Design a protein. Structure first.
Length: 93
């Protein structure tokens, strides 16, 4: 449930994301391509749910709708995204 605000420059036509969904909830990041725009984004990771793009609420949206919104961003443009991490195990030391 950790929300993260992302600000990205879309310098080419491909961000490096593969986005999926399980039929409900938020779409999520299934893959981030090595050496891509999104691989270089400090606070985004495989498994993150995409909650908003440019302030637009994407709850309930399918992977093709979320990907369409990213693909429609003009090249050269900056954009924001709110990603939410799933609750996964960790260890303290």
């Amino acid at each position: 449930g950790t929300e993260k605000t992302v600000k990205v420059i879309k310098d080419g036509p491909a961000l490096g994301l593969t986005i999926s969904d399980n039929g409900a909830g938020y779409a999520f990041i299934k893959k981030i391509r090595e050496d891509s725009i999104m691989s270089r984004v400090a606070n985004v990771a495989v498994g993150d749910h995409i909650a908003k793009i440019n302030g637009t609420d994407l709850n309930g949206c399918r992977h093709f709708e979320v990907a369409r919104m990213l693909k429609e961003i003009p090249i050269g443009s900056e954009f924001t995204m709110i990603c939410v991490e799933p609750k996964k195990s960790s260890s303290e030391a």
